[PDB]
Amino acid sequence: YEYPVFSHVQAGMFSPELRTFTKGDAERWVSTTKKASDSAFWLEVEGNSMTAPTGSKPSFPDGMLILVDPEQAVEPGDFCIARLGGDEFTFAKLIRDSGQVFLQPLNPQYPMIPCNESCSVVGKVIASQWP
Amino acid sequence: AIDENKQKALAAALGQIEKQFGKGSIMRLGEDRSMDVETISTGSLSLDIALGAGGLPMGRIVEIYGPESSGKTTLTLQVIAAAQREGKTCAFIDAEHALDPIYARKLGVDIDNLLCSQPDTGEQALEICDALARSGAVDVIVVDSVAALTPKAEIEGEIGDSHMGLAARMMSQAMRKLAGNLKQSNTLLIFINQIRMKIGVMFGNPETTTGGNALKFYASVRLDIRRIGAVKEGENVVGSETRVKVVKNKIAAPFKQAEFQILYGEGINFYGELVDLGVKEKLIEKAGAWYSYKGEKIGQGKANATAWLKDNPETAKEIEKKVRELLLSNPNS
Amino acid sequence: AIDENKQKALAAALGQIEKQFGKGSIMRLGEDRSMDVETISTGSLSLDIALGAGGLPMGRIVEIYGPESSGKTTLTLQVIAAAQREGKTCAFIDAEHALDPIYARKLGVDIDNLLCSQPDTGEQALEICDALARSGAVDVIVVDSVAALTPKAEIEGEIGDSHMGLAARMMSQAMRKLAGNLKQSNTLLIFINQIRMKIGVMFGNPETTTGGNALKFYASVRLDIRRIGAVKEGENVVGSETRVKVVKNKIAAPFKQAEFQILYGEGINFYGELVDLGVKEKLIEKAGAWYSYKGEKIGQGKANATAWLKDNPETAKEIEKKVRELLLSNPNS
DNA sequence: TTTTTT
Ligand SMILES: Nc1ncnc2c1ncn2[C@@H]1O[C@H](COP(=O)(O)OP(=O)(O)OP(O)(O)=S)[C@@H](O)[C@H]1O
Ligand SMILES: Nc1ncnc2c1ncn2[C@@H]1O[C@H](COP(=O)(O)OP(=O)(O)OP(O)(O)=S)[C@@H](O)[C@H]1O
Ligand SMILES: [Mg+2]
Ligand SMILES: [Mg+2]
DSSP: OEEEEEEEEESSSOEEOOSEEETTOOSOEEEOSOOOOTTOEEEEEEOSTTOOOTTSSOOOOTTOEEEEETTSOOOTTSEEEEEETTTEEEEEEEEEETTEEEEEOSSTTSOOEEOOTTEEEEEEEEEEEOO | OHHHHHHHHHHHHHHHHHHHHOTTSSOOGGGOGGGSOOEEOOSOHHHHHHTSSSSEETTSEEEEEOSTTSSHHHHHHHHHHHHHHTTOOEEEEETTSOOOHHHHHHTTOOTTTOEEEOOSSHHHHHHHHHHHHHHSOOOEEEEEOGGGOOOHHHHHSOTTOOOTTHHHHHHHHHHHHHHHHHHHHTOEEEEEEOEEEOTTEEEEOOEEETTOSHHHHHOSEEEEEEEEEEEEETTEEEEEEEEEEEEEESSSOSOOEEEEEEETTTEEOHHHHHHHHHHHTTSSEEETTEEEETTEEEEEHHHHHHHHHHHOHHHHHHHHHHHHHHHOSSOOO | OHHHHHHHHHHHHHHHHHHHHOTTSSEEGGGOGGGOOOEEOOSOHHHHHHTSSSSEETTSEEEEEOSTTSSHHHHHHHHHHHHHHTTOOEEEEETTSOOOHHHHHHHTOOGGGOEEEOOSSHHHHHHHHHHHHHHSOOSEEEEEOGGGOOOHHHHHSOTTOOOTTHHHHHHHHHHHHHHHHHHHHTOEEEEEEOEEEOSOBOSSOSEEESSOSHHHHHOSEEEEEEEEEEEEETTEEEEEEEEEEEEEESSSOOOOEEEEEEETTTEEOHHHHHHHHHHHTTSEEEETTEEEETTEEEEESHHHHHHHHHHOHHHHHHHHHHHHHHHOSSOOO
């Protein structure tokens, strides 16, 4: 199984993404053993905010591709791609602490991202491949 | 020798062009006062800061879009009320047929002076806007929900009939015919847009706006407004927390964001924006949940600070002048 | 000087617009009596209070959605019966093909004067709605189960064919073609929707409506109805406890919610609403499990108090009048 | 250009 590679996602900032991606877009396709849906795609990480301290896994350093499946539900404690305001994206782990949704990073140096009503989950991060 | 001949030829060509087309047909960009950018307040100080030049530009096309009940009509009516306070004449093209005159009055709009038109067709709406712009007596025109700008053929047609790009072509022709007229008459045309879903977008922005592609090119400012939370007085929801992102800007830097509260029956919370901007500009001290101005504890929480600044007009005006001097990148003359 | 010229130009352009498009094409919003919001009862007093304006606005689009057996059809038929009691003519577009005329007669609907259509396709249903709105002789239209508005191309094809955004496109076109007609004829169109599943919902329920996004933008009032319990006469379940949330309101403040009982065969328990509202407005004294009015003990338990109010019409009228005076923020007459 | 669907 091989899936498209679409741009990058900022790990801990909710950075804007200018450009829109269709299935016909992208000239990079990366294969893996993970059996995701046909809407799944690869996102490559720029940012060290989701790099876990050594000895604890999983970790997502800058440059590694993460497979995102929008057709799989994200539960608290899972890793997801979140969209803020329709244009901004982030890659963080999802926890619903005290009835308010938060995106917390694997790097303590970076702060927890509060989520508002304009926030939604793009998909679930289900695989990781170095390019 | 060579340069003097070039100057003579250029002067002759310029004189010929002025004789053919008029006095202001061609001239140097530096000595063209008609091309100066003039702005008006949007009713939100944070949005005035985010727009860079201090508000929406006169003589341009502005697009505001977002999801349902994101505050597009309220922001529009706050702009209209701010313009009407300055003696300007405004017009509301209510293509959605969903304007409440009483609520518009409650937002500060001079309803007795607001020209209101509920056009049958999209062509009628755009022709009314064109006539109002050509008049030179209307300063702000708002077209609510260009998604409701239905072409005459589609209205005369049946449900399910296909009219491929007919509204898009009509909006393209409207932009072509309206840009110059709006620039000449210094009229601000604000287009309100609804959001539709792009089918087949695996990553990125999944939304488009209605009406095609012409509005994206011709708009000098494009605002993406969204509801990011609720304002509650304990149990009742009394307002909404609103974010505005400047996705396009031809008069300043884009992608700046503005946060404010829209209170139901009052509109944009100007005083709360003043509180936040004073807090950011080191004018109001925030110790945890305690807001203090120059040592005097003004209240606890945003609501109490807003109420106190409402109760003390002198200090509110002082903080407002300080914030306008400091934060405004392009303070208007 | 220039102000007189501006006034002259404004008058001339306005006269030109009226000449081109009609006498009511453009005018000041203050003197526009066609923009006044008029409402009709929803059959539930708590809902009329929660709606702020006293009911569903005439000439607008209203969406009522919720889970199965939540009371959408019953509430819509109570709206129809209340409208028909005021001499209005109503139509019911039964797209789901599951309307029981005997139950409608039980709820109080005049079956003989109710126009009913069981359309084959969604295009036919929306064309019938457009024709009824353009006629001007129908005051209330109901489209049962927007989810059942099947496109003609979807009906003609076989099961398994993918019609991507066909229903959403059809509903967007219908909203475009119907908003103006409904506003012109002052016809209330109520769309009943089903609830469907949704991915990625950070806040609120993981639910969505059918038919696309246009109905979210075009509806003046959107109602979320849910069944929050059961009403039992001993061991028999005789009704349902229902909560209606105003998730969208264009004529008053949104997010207010109402609670009432839908009793099978009778509809909305108006007298139970009267009991609860008189209790909350200190009109009916609540002493633990005992209810009293003006010192006189009226009964114990909500059911027995409601039975008492049925037994005594005069005190019912008095409590209703006082509650309507105290709580309705927009009285018309 | 147009528009989600489970
Ligand atoms: N008459 C009113 N009274 C009180 N609150 C209102 C009224 N009209 C609108 N609101 C609220 O004000 C907020 C902003 O509303 P709008 O300005 O109409 O936004 P909108 O983008 O125009 O939404 P649309 O046009 O229905 S898609 C929302 O929370 C509305 O519920
Ligand atoms: N003919 C009937 N006689 C008695 N009770 C009924 C009858 N029809 C419906 N009910 C009950 O009335 C309540 C509301 O019914 P409806 O108005 O049909 O709900 P609904 O929102 O339309 O849900 P749907 O259309 O079935 S998905 C439910 O508790 C039903 O069991
Ligand atoms: Mg609006
Ligand atoms: Mg039903």
